[PDB]
């Protein structure tokens, strides 16, 4: 969160929270309700967003869903979409927190280890998260879509 990140950096200095840091907390706390609304819309349409992302990701990269790929068969395809759903849940968490530290902790640390062990192609996962970004942004208002794009962008940037 904005609060914990500011507190941690202030802790490094051991100084009590600087006036600018406290003002940052004031800004974040004041805009929290709008953040809640963004997360609410994404979770309310969580099913539609995730399934559409699956359609678009498979269409960009048919090879992942082709025979001999990780997402072959209904069960394997469903697990791929479950991963997309997990990352959408993480994105809503990150929106509410106002920082990307929750997304990083839950899902992005060591993702390359996990996914190549599973055999899944990480760049294809990145394309899927990009599809999630586009779908969610289309649902969101222009002001809301700008911030949600940043939270999705950390995920795709880590994936690379």
């Amino acid at each position: 969160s904005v609060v914990t990140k500011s507190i941690v950096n202030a802790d490094a200095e051991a100084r009590y929270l600087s006036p600018g840091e406290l003002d940052r907390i004031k800004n974040f706390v004041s805009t929290g309700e709008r953040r809640l609304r963004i997360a609410q819309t994404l979770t309310e349409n969580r099913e539609r967003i995730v399934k559409q992302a699956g359609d678009q990701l498979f269409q960009k990269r048919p090879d992942v869903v082709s025979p001999g790929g990780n997402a072959y068969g209904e069960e394997m395809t469903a697990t791929c979409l479950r991963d997309l759903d997990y990352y959408l849940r993480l994105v809503t968490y990150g929106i509410v927190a106002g920082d990307v530290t929750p997304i990083e902790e839950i899902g992005l640390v060591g993702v390359r280890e996990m996914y190549n062990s599973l055999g899944t192609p990480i760049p294809a996962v990145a394309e899927g998260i990009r599809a999630m970004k586009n779908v969610a942004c289309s649902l969101l208002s222009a002001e809301d879509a700008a911030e949600a794009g940043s939270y999705f962008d950390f995920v795709i940037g880590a994936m690379q």
Partner: protein, 48 residues
């Protein structure tokens, strides 16, 4: 027999406001921002 203070005459100000510096800045801003794109709205390319 004359009245030194006949009555106090109203005056029409010479300097018209909404040309004064502060309102002029604000009038420019409201007009220009209205013509520009609108935050927090789904349809913005439709509007003329």
């Amino acid at each position: 027999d004359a009245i030194v203070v006949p009555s106090f005459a109203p005056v029409k100000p010479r300097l018209d406001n909404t040309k004064l510096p502060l309102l002029s800045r604000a009038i420019a801003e409201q007009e220009a921002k209205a013509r520009q794109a609108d935050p927090s709205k789904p349809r913005f390319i439709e509007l003329g």
